[PDB]
C-alpha cells in the first residue's frame, strides 16, 4: 500500500504533499515509466557489459528492479 507513487518534489503527474499521482497517467517517476505511462514491455533498464541478457522492463513495470 505504499502511498508513494512518485518521488518528485516538482512533477505534475505526482504530488509530492502526498508522494502520489493524478489519476491520468499510471506513475509520476520510475526508469520503465515515460510520459506518467508503464513503458512497453521489452524496455531496457539497465545495461552492464558482460555477456548476459539486458534488463528490459515487463512493460507493466514502472521502475526496473534486478534480477540474476
Not at 518521488?7 to 517517476?29: H, I, M, V, Y
Not at 524496455?43 to 552492464?48: D, E, G, N, T
Amino acid at each position: 500500500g505504499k502511498e508513494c507513487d512518485c518521488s518528485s518534489p516538482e512533477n505534475p503527474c505526482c504530488d509530492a504533499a502526498t508522494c502520489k499521482l493524478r489519476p491520468g497517467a499510471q506513475c509520476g517517476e520510475g526508469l520503465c515509466c515515460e510520459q506518467c505511462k508503464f513503458s512497453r514491455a521489452g524496455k531496457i533498464c539497465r545495461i552492464p557489459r558482460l555477456d548476459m541478457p539486458d534488463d528490459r522492463c515487463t512493460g507493466q513495470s514502472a521502475d526496473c528492479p534486478r534480477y540474476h
